[PDB]
Amino acid sequence: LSRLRAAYTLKVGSEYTHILDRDERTWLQDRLEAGMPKPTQAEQKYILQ
Amino acid sequence: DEIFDAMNVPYTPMRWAQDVPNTGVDKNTRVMQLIEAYRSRGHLIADTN
Amino acid sequence: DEIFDAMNVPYTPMRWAQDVPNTGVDKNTRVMQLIEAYRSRGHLIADTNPLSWVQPGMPVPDHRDLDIETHNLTIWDLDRTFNVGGFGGKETMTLREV
């Protein structure tokens, strides 16, 4: 549940399982389940600017 | 529900239930069905609005 | 492949393989993944074209997930029983019945 929640129920809702090609659907799956990286302080200040 | 609404938790809380009795039903194959459901439709309960 | 082409069987034949060695890998959860694959993309190998025609120029999606070998299952598992999690209203079933 923590892995599924981090990947699919926080601030990003993804739709990708309707993709037919197995390689393209698995690339999206593996990147979404790797998670959204913790942003650095420098990154946070760039977004604030 | 009242606490979550007050604290702005955009998720349904965990519900109290009794531990399900040991009948024939296998849980591992049903954990797989839950994983597919989140991959396919997890965006329906994501904090996107 | 040659026999099936001659008899106009629009399906890929079963392939020879060795019975997979007993490592940690569970097969029941992989039978569930095969059931989802057929429900979602089984139409990609359905006998829907009256012509034995594949349009050159159109891209073809990969559907190896419809082959039992991709889920580490072989012809040797056809008459073994597996947990299918309520599929067809049943708890257990053979891979042949699935």
PDB file of N, CA and C in Angstrom, chain B residues 24-26 28-30 32-33, chain C residues 28-29 32-33 83 85-86 91:
ATOM      1  N   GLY B  24     -11.631 -21.213   2.577  1.00  0.00           N
ATOM      2  CA  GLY B  24     -10.726 -21.623   1.511  1.00  0.00           C
ATOM      3  C   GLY B  24     -10.008 -20.459   0.854  1.00  0.00           C
ATOM      4  N   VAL B  25     -10.633 -19.278   0.853  1.00  0.00           N
ATOM      5  CA  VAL B  25     -10.164 -18.081   0.162  1.00  0.00           C
ATOM      6  C   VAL B  25      -8.664 -17.776   0.386  1.00  0.00           C
ATOM      7  N   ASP B  26      -7.921 -17.650  -0.734  1.00  0.00           N
ATOM      8  CA  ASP B  26      -6.500 -17.311  -0.774  1.00  0.00           C
ATOM      9  C   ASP B  26      -6.369 -15.809  -0.868  1.00  0.00           C
ATOM     10  N   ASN B  28      -3.226 -14.113  -1.399  1.00  0.00           N
ATOM     11  CA  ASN B  28      -2.139 -13.694  -2.286  1.00  0.00           C
ATOM     12  C   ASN B  28      -2.630 -13.313  -3.687  1.00  0.00           C
ATOM     13  N   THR B  29      -3.525 -14.114  -4.261  1.00  0.00           N
ATOM     14  CA  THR B  29      -4.077 -13.812  -5.580  1.00  0.00           C
ATOM     15  C   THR B  29      -4.952 -12.533  -5.511  1.00  0.00           C
ATOM     16  N   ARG B  30      -5.553 -12.234  -4.351  1.00  0.00           N
ATOM     17  CA  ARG B  30      -6.366 -11.033  -4.201  1.00  0.00           C
ATOM     18  C   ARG B  30      -5.497  -9.775  -3.959  1.00  0.00           C
ATOM     19  N   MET B  32      -2.738  -9.435  -5.648  1.00  0.00           N
ATOM     20  CA  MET B  32      -2.387  -9.152  -7.035  1.00  0.00           C
ATOM     21  C   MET B  32      -3.483  -8.348  -7.735  1.00  0.00           C
ATOM     22  N   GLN B  33      -4.752  -8.680  -7.469  1.00  0.00           N
ATOM     23  CA  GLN B  33      -5.891  -7.981  -8.052  1.00  0.00           C
ATOM     24  C   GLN B  33      -5.962  -6.529  -7.556  1.00  0.00           C
TER      25      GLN B  33
ATOM     26  N   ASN C  28       1.280 -19.036  -8.797  1.00  0.00           N
ATOM     27  CA  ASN C  28      -0.117 -18.620  -8.654  1.00  0.00           C
ATOM     28  C   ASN C  28      -0.321 -17.126  -8.925  1.00  0.00           C
ATOM     29  N   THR C  29       0.558 -16.281  -8.390  1.00  0.00           N
ATOM     30  CA  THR C  29       0.464 -14.841  -8.623  1.00  0.00           C
ATOM     31  C   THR C  29       0.748 -14.524 -10.114  1.00  0.00           C
ATOM     32  N   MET C  32      -2.387 -15.137 -12.192  1.00  0.00           N
ATOM     33  CA  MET C  32      -3.271 -13.982 -12.086  1.00  0.00           C
ATOM     34  C   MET C  32      -2.879 -12.887 -13.079  1.00  0.00           C
ATOM     35  N   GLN C  33      -1.572 -12.657 -13.254  1.00  0.00           N
ATOM     36  CA  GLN C  33      -1.062 -11.657 -14.185  1.00  0.00           C
ATOM     37  C   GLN C  33      -1.389 -12.037 -15.637  1.00  0.00           C
ATOM     38  N   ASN C  83      -3.988 -21.428  -7.753  1.00  0.00           N
ATOM     39  CA  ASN C  83      -4.931 -20.517  -7.149  1.00  0.00           C
ATOM     40  C   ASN C  83      -5.248 -19.449  -8.164  1.00  0.00           C
ATOM     41  N   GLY C  85      -7.919 -16.970  -7.576  1.00  0.00           N
ATOM     42  CA  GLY C  85      -8.581 -15.853  -6.914  1.00  0.00           C
ATOM     43  C   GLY C  85      -9.968 -15.492  -7.398  1.00  0.00           C
ATOM     44  N   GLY C  86     -10.859 -16.478  -7.449  1.00  0.00           N
ATOM     45  CA  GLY C  86     -12.247 -16.264  -7.814  1.00  0.00           C
ATOM     46  C   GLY C  86     -12.556 -16.208  -9.289  1.00  0.00           C
ATOM     47  N   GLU C  91     -11.873 -21.079  -6.796  1.00  0.00           N
ATOM     48  CA  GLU C  91     -10.679 -20.750  -6.021  1.00  0.00           C
ATOM     49  C   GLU C  91      -9.427 -21.361  -6.682  1.00  0.00           C
TER      50      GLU C  91
END
